[PDB]
Design a protein around this ligand. Structure first.
Ligand SMILES: [K+]
Ligand SMILES: [K+]
Ligand SMILES: [K+]
Ligand SMILES: [K+]
Ligand SMILES: [K+]
Ligand SMILES: [K+]
Ligand SMILES: [K+]
Ligand SMILES: [K+]
Ligand SMILES: [K+]
Ligand SMILES: [K+]
Ligand SMILES: [K+]
Ligand SMILES: [K+]
Ligand SMILES: [Mg+2]
Ligand SMILES: [Mg+2]
Ligand SMILES: [Mg+2]
Ligand SMILES: [Mg+2]
Ligand SMILES: [Mg+2]
Ligand SMILES: [Mg+2]
Ligand SMILES: [Mg+2]
Ligand SMILES: [Mg+2]
Ligand SMILES: [Mg+2]
Ligand SMILES: [Mg+2]
Ligand SMILES: [Mg+2]
Ligand SMILES: [Mg+2]
Ligand SMILES: [Mg+2]
Ligand SMILES: [Mg+2]
Ligand SMILES: [Mg+2]
Ligand SMILES: [Mg+2]
Ligand SMILES: [Mg+2]
Ligand SMILES: [Mg+2]
Ligand SMILES: [Mg+2]
Ligand SMILES: [Mg+2]
Ligand SMILES: [Mg+2]
Ligand SMILES: [Mg+2]
Ligand SMILES: [Mg+2]
Ligand SMILES: [Mg+2]
Ligand SMILES: [Mg+2]
Ligand SMILES: [Mg+2]
Ligand SMILES: [Mg+2]
Ligand SMILES: [Mg+2]
Ligand SMILES: [Mg+2]
Ligand SMILES: [Mg+2]
Ligand SMILES: [Mg+2]
Ligand SMILES: [Mg+2]
Ligand SMILES: [Mg+2]
Ligand SMILES: [Mg+2]
Ligand SMILES: [Mg+2]
Ligand SMILES: [Mg+2]
Ligand SMILES: [Mg+2]
Ligand SMILES: [Mg+2]
Ligand SMILES: [Mg+2]
Ligand SMILES: [Mg+2]
Ligand SMILES: [Mg+2]
Ligand SMILES: [Mg+2]
Ligand SMILES: [Mg+2]
Ligand SMILES: [Mg+2]
Ligand SMILES: [Mg+2]
Ligand SMILES: [Mg+2]
Ligand SMILES: [Mg+2]
Ligand SMILES: [Mg+2]
Ligand SMILES: [Mg+2]
Ligand SMILES: [Mg+2]
Ligand SMILES: [Mg+2]
Ligand SMILES: [Mg+2]
Ligand SMILES: [Mg+2]
Ligand SMILES: [Mg+2]
Ligand SMILES: [Mg+2]
Ligand SMILES: [Mg+2]
Ligand SMILES: [Mg+2]
Ligand SMILES: [Mg+2]
Ligand SMILES: [Mg+2]
Ligand SMILES: [Mg+2]
Ligand SMILES: [Mg+2]
Ligand SMILES: [Mg+2]
Ligand SMILES: [Mg+2]
Ligand SMILES: [Mg+2]
Ligand SMILES: [Mg+2]
Ligand SMILES: [Mg+2]
Ligand SMILES: [Mg+2]
Ligand SMILES: [Mg+2]
Ligand SMILES: [Mg+2]
Ligand SMILES: [Mg+2]
Ligand SMILES: [Mg+2]
Ligand SMILES: [Mg+2]
Ligand SMILES: [Mg+2]
Ligand SMILES: [Mg+2]
Ligand SMILES: [Mg+2]
Ligand SMILES: [Mg+2]
Ligand SMILES: [Mg+2]
Ligand SMILES: [Mg+2]
Ligand SMILES: [Mg+2]
Ligand SMILES: [Mg+2]
Ligand SMILES: [Mg+2]
Ligand SMILES: [Mg+2]
Ligand SMILES: [Mg+2]
Ligand SMILES: [Mg+2]
Ligand SMILES: [Mg+2]
Ligand SMILES: [Mg+2]
Ligand SMILES: [Mg+2]
Ligand SMILES: [Mg+2]
Ligand SMILES: [Mg+2]
Ligand SMILES: [Mg+2]
Ligand SMILES: [Mg+2]
Ligand SMILES: [Mg+2]
Ligand SMILES: [Mg+2]
Ligand SMILES: [Mg+2]
Ligand SMILES: [Mg+2]
Ligand SMILES: [Mg+2]
Ligand SMILES: [Mg+2]
Ligand SMILES: [Mg+2]
Ligand SMILES: [Mg+2]
Ligand SMILES: [Mg+2]
Ligand SMILES: [Mg+2]
Ligand SMILES: [Mg+2]
Ligand SMILES: [Mg+2]
Ligand SMILES: [Mg+2]
Ligand SMILES: [Mg+2]
Ligand SMILES: [Mg+2]
Ligand SMILES: [Mg+2]
Ligand SMILES: [Mg+2]
Ligand SMILES: [Mg+2]
Ligand SMILES: [Mg+2]
Ligand SMILES: [Mg+2]
Ligand SMILES: [Mg+2]
Ligand SMILES: [Mg+2]
Ligand SMILES: [Mg+2]
Ligand SMILES: [Zn+2]
Lengths: 99, 83, 208, 99
RNA sequence: UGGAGAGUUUGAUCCUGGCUCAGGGUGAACGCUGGCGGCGUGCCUAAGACAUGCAAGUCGUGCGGGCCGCGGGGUUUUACUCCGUGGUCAGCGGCGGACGGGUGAGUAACGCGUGGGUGACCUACCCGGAAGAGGGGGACAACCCGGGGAAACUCGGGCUAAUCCCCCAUGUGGACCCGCCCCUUGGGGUGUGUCCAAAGGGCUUUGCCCGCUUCCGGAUGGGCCCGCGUCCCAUCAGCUAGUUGGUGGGGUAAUGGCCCACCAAGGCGACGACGGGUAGCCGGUCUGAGAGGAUGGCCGGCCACAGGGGCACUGAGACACGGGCCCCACUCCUACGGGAGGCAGCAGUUAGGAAUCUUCCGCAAUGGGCGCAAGCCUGACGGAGCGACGCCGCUUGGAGGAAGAAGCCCUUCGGGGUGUAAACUCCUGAACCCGGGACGAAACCCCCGACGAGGGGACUGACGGUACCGGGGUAAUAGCGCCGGCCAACUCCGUGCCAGCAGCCGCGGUAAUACGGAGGGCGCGAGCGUUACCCGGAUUCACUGGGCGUAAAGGGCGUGUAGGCGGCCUGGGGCGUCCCAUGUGAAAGACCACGGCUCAACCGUGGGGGAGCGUGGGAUACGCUCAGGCUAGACG
């Protein structure tokens, strides 16, 4: 007895699953990179941080991880990685981090 | 978007419109940004349509969109005339 | 309402001869020329000293019944006059005299103000060419009060304007008898009206 | 223009924070008497530079914490413990009226 | 351009003092009465419960289909299949559903008002500017097959398109880490490193249109923060554990104790915390000479809410009235396993109540959404209907008409009154009856031009055969309250402290201007009264503007805390105070003028305003503060 605006609801569900996935990836990768920064493995750490930043910006392309908020996540990731490698040294791969 | 449209201010069977700049999302008799003219459809007085041309040109320059009736009334006041 | 009913009983009650029938208030038949006491069973009895409220109420009722204006319009006109700048009483009188029915009476088109009211209401009077049928219409200085061309053949208008030949009009009015028209030249001053009313008494009556 | 008040530091017992008491005179809205009211503001002292009794200027600032919305602009005059003593006696009188 | 008082304590008086009345107002209700129209207005109670219909959709110029039908092809026929086309149906996809509309529950709060801050922020569509769109890949519906369920609906398998999703490239540019410079909270620039772009469709078809991507700016809308203002009770005096702060994090577009770890012990309060009660707030509105009091309905702004409570998803934007989830109460279906629902949208039903409307017409106008457009949707809106609920206009006749009919009421029995009132005479013509008959409506669109400017053309009226105009044309609703004083209006009879009246003083127990009726009179009039409520008078919470010896009121006395108040002279500052300039003070309303409906109510245009607050500059007499000095107060 209702109107077909239920269609909107359906779409949201799809979009929901689309978003939760991307974020769930980003978070995961971030953690991974930070681990390698704590253990001193700088090459792999930066190599994974590059992919994390890429996934962040790709999520920002759509309505999932829009706005800056994406820049916020990128900033926090790069800061934490550079800080943890400074506790060990030798930024081997020279990836996302500026000279 | 911001639009240039008419607001109804006369009484019943006595319509009087204010040509007005307002946000489209607001009610037609609600808080507008600026009154840029007035319009009397029944032609009761010899001055039944007045428009501030420079102000209308400004609001069109900044990105306002008039209604078909509003655009007609403006065109009658030479807002778009470039002769 | 219009109080419609006996009128010369007001000629009697107000103690001053009013002119509500036009004629017959000039003829020795007004019942004021022969019975100056107020109406009722207790009219010929010795009157007691009236209170101040009695005096002011009687004066206001006199001035109001002279024009035949209801209490609503009367109080409205008075408040309008008190809002304006100037003497409240003279402005109130100028407003009352500016009514279309009163102007028709003053211009001699009708013998009484109520006959003038009927002449206006039935569309027999025009203002600046356009027909006007509202007694409460306010005449502005310069307005031409004429008789409808379709009504200029009526017997009563013929009689009234045939009697107006040679009669003078108020200093604030002009009259053309052949064309059956006239002009409201200006607002009448207090010195132009010979009404038996003290305006300050009415001002004090509404001051309460 | 960001509001700039002037008051007395009456509490340095917090970390990087000072309680500045600010008075104000104004005619009474109905009785015309010039009355004197006061208000305590929690201001930001990121250097622990200001101490008790210091009369300081305070400036409207970006929120630092809940109830902390002001920064200490500059020092008007050094420690004058008289106003502090007045405030402390005003507070101490409250214990005498309980029951 | 503004200010009235009166009745009432006494045998009489002056005062004090309360009560009452005259005034104005209402989203009103009730009684009696009730003719017309215009404009407004109409659940104040149960934010109780709701049958039924409508109220939010729209795009085939994003994409592929199903069903029904037609036409033309490949074929000799059949089978099979291809193309075009019409209708219909949903689907995938985009935009809108966050606006508009309703309501006052809850909230004493940065909720609102006002003035500021954002170097701590966002903004779809819209406008301006710079640049770009290369190649490849994939999935889910529709649909086909099967299963489960009474139903709502649900599950599995398989095929497929795109402006759906993904990868690589191009890096105008932008994002981030780090460094430098300017600037000063996270603003702007610069370098290296790294990371990030896109979608096609339509034709009048190789040229345009609707779009797409990245970036800067505009515009609009909003988020957050701060100063000041915002009811009653102190028979609420102490409140606080995320409490106050810090550090580091999480989170958001963004600050924040918003949230979380760890550390410090703070934070608030008689300048009224906390608690209780009440209540959306304002522009304004009513009243008032003003100050002030009262109030927040209609209209406009902001807030909050969508049966009660909680929660996230999607999105530029929601913690989403007609979206989703869970708990509770309720109603309905039920194969008893489980489901469906949410008028404080329009109208209507029912309950409550003293009381509040039509289950109406229309997309013509204005406004909104989608669309290139045609157009579609719009219970927004424009209208009509009902209700003297309010305001305004108007009618129920006009003129003549007896020293005065009758009836009725008084009466000194002479007469007086109802009263020119009536009947009557002449006159106009409310209603009605005909005919004409609108403004509101010129744009979108089409044609020319260049899809621009400009010109031209055509369509479209719910109200409604309404308004209005012309002709014809009948004397044709009046009621309600009061008549002792305040307070305008008096006699007769009946009644006999009875029956009753009464706002206050008070009237009635035999001859009542007070009861009841009559005659007469007074006041208003399609109204008149009553009740309720607000302001008024009331200088009766006294800032303007009161008091305390005996009228209500000096604390039993002291010491003294906070607080209030502060002698004379000089100087510094300029906080109070004052001045100038400037910003702000939306519109509506209020005031003034002119104008439009024949007037008015109603409405339009223009004018003038204004405290407060922000900013810049200035003054220093007084109050303030600091420094110094004096001795008349005070102390020794
Ligand atoms: K005052
Ligand atoms: K304590
Ligand atoms: K007396
Ligand atoms: K399936
Ligand atoms: K670079
Ligand atoms: K919704
Ligand atoms: K054109
Ligand atoms: K006629
Ligand atoms: K006629
Ligand atoms: K009896
Ligand atoms: K009586
Ligand atoms: K005593
Ligand atoms: Mg839908
Ligand atoms: Mg849809
Ligand atoms: Mg994981
Ligand atoms: Mg989001
Ligand atoms: Mg809005
Ligand atoms: Mg013109
Ligand atoms: Mg132009
Ligand atoms: Mg006057
Ligand atoms: Mg006056
Ligand atoms: Mg101070
Ligand atoms: Mg400290
Ligand atoms: Mg902090
Ligand atoms: Mg003067
Ligand atoms: Mg003066
Ligand atoms: Mg008294
Ligand atoms: Mg006594
Ligand atoms: Mg006595
Ligand atoms: Mg005595
Ligand atoms: Mg009253
Ligand atoms: Mg009243
Ligand atoms: Mg009735
Ligand atoms: Mg009506
Ligand atoms: Mg209505
Ligand atoms: Mg209600
Ligand atoms: Mg109310
Ligand atoms: Mg398109
Ligand atoms: Mg075929
Ligand atoms: Mg062949
Ligand atoms: Mg065959
Ligand atoms: Mg089809
Ligand atoms: Mg479809
Ligand atoms: Mg489906
Ligand atoms: Mg709304
Ligand atoms: Mg409370
Ligand atoms: Mg409280
Ligand atoms: Mg504020
Ligand atoms: Mg507050
Ligand atoms: Mg503000
Ligand atoms: Mg976009
Ligand atoms: Mg652009
Ligand atoms: Mg493909
Ligand atoms: Mg494929
Ligand atoms: Mg495939
Ligand atoms: Mg298949
Ligand atoms: Mg499958
Ligand atoms: Mg570059
Ligand atoms: Mg790339
Ligand atoms: Mg895409
Ligand atoms: Mg592609
Ligand atoms: Mg081509
Ligand atoms: Mg907290
Ligand atoms: Mg923190
Ligand atoms: Mg942070
Ligand atoms: Mg968000
Ligand atoms: Mg607290
Ligand atoms: Mg305080
Ligand atoms: Mg409440
Ligand atoms: Mg007034
Ligand atoms: Mg006032
Ligand atoms: Mg209030
Ligand atoms: Mg409201
Ligand atoms: Mg409102
Ligand atoms: Mg309900
Ligand atoms: Mg619920
Ligand atoms: Mg709820
Ligand atoms: Mg969107
Ligand atoms: Mg909400
Ligand atoms: Mg919801
Ligand atoms: Mg609903
Ligand atoms: Mg459901
Ligand atoms: Mg009932
Ligand atoms: Mg209605
Ligand atoms: Mg309809
Ligand atoms: Mg429409
Ligand atoms: Mg339209
Ligand atoms: Mg309507
Ligand atoms: Mg009336
Ligand atoms: Mg007569
Ligand atoms: Mg006739
Ligand atoms: Mg026309
Ligand atoms: Mg159309
Ligand atoms: Mg062409
Ligand atoms: Mg044209
Ligand atoms: Mg029609
Ligand atoms: Mg006629
Ligand atoms: Mg009397
Ligand atoms: Mg009585
Ligand atoms: Mg009463
Ligand atoms: Mg007797
Ligand atoms: Mg008797
Ligand atoms: Mg009597
Ligand atoms: Mg009578
Ligand atoms: Mg009444
Ligand atoms: Mg009162
Ligand atoms: Mg008072
Ligand atoms: Mg007074
Ligand atoms: Mg009192
Ligand atoms: Mg006083
Ligand atoms: Mg006193
Ligand atoms: Mg004593
Ligand atoms: Mg002191
Ligand atoms: Mg002291
Ligand atoms: Mg002094
Ligand atoms: Mg002092
Ligand atoms: Mg000095
Ligand atoms: Mg100053
Ligand atoms: Mg204004
Ligand atoms: Mg006023
Ligand atoms: Mg006029
Ligand atoms: Mg001014
Ligand atoms: Mg200044
Ligand atoms: Mg000086
Ligand atoms: Mg000294
Ligand atoms: Mg001594
Ligand atoms: Zn007479």
């Amino acid at each position: 007895r209702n109107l077909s605006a239920l269609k909107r609801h359906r779409q949201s569900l799809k979009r929901r699953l689309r978003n939760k996935a991307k974020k769930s990836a980003i978070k995961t990768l971030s953690k991974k990179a930070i681990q390698l920064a704590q253990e001193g493995k700088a090459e792999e750490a930066l190599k994974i941080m590059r992919k994390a930043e890429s996934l962040i910006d790709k999520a920002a392309k759509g309505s999932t991880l829009h706005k800056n908020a994406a820049a916020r996540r990128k900033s926090r990731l790069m800061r934490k990685v550079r800080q943890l490698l400074e506790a060990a040294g030798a930024p081997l791969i020279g990836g996302g981090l500026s000279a | 978007m911001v639009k240039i449209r008419l607001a109804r201010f006369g009484s019943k069977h006595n319509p009087h419109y204010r040509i007005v700049v307002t946000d489209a999302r607001r009610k037609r008799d609600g808080k507008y940004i600026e009154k840029i003219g007035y319009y009397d459809p029944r032609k009761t007085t010899p001055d039944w349509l007045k428009v501030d041309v420079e102000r209308a040109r400004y609001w069109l320059s900044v990105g306002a969109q008039p209604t078909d009736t509003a655009r007609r009334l403006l065109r009658q006041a030479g807002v778009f005339r470039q002769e | 309402g219009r109080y419609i009913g006996p009128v010369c009983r007001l000629c009697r009650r107000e103690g001053v001869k009013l002119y509500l029938k036009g004629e017959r208030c000039y003829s020795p038949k007004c019942a004021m020329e022969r019975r100056p006491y107020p109406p009722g069973q207790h009219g010929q009895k010795r009157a007691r000293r009236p209170s101040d409220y009695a005096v002011r109420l009687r004066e206001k009722q006199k001035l109001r019944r002279i024009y035949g204006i209801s209490e609503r319009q009367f109080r409205n006109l008075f408040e309008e006059a008190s809002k304006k700048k100037g003497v409240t009483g003279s402005v109130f009188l100028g407003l009352l005299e500016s009514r279309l029915d009163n102007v028709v009476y003053r211009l001699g088109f009708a013998v009484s103000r109520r006959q003038a009211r009927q002449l206006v209401r039935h569309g027999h009077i025009t203002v600046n060419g356009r027909r006007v049928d509202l007694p409460s219409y306010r005449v502005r200085p310069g307005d031409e009060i004429a008789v409808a061309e379709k009504s200029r053949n009526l017997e009563l208008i013929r009689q009234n304007l045939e009697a107006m030949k040679g009669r003078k009009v108020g200093p604030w009015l002009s009259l053309d008898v052949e064309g059956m028209k006239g002009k409201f030249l200006r607002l009448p001053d207090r010195e132009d009206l010979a009404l038996p009313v003290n305006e300050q008494l009415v001002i004090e009556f509404y001051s309460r | 223009p960001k509001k700039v008040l002037t008051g007395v530091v009456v509490s340095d017992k917090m970390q990087k924070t000072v309680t500045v008491l600010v008075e104000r005179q104004f005619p009474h809205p109905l009785y015309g008497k010039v009355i004197k009211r006061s208000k305590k503001y929690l201001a930001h002292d990121p250097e622990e530079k200001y101490k008790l009794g210091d009369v300081v200027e305070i400036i409207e600032s970006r929120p630092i914490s809940k109830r902390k919305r002001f920064r200490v602009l500059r020092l008007v005059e050094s420690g004058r413990m008289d106003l502090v003593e007045k405030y402390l006696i005003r507070r101490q009188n409250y214990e005498s009226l309980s029951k």
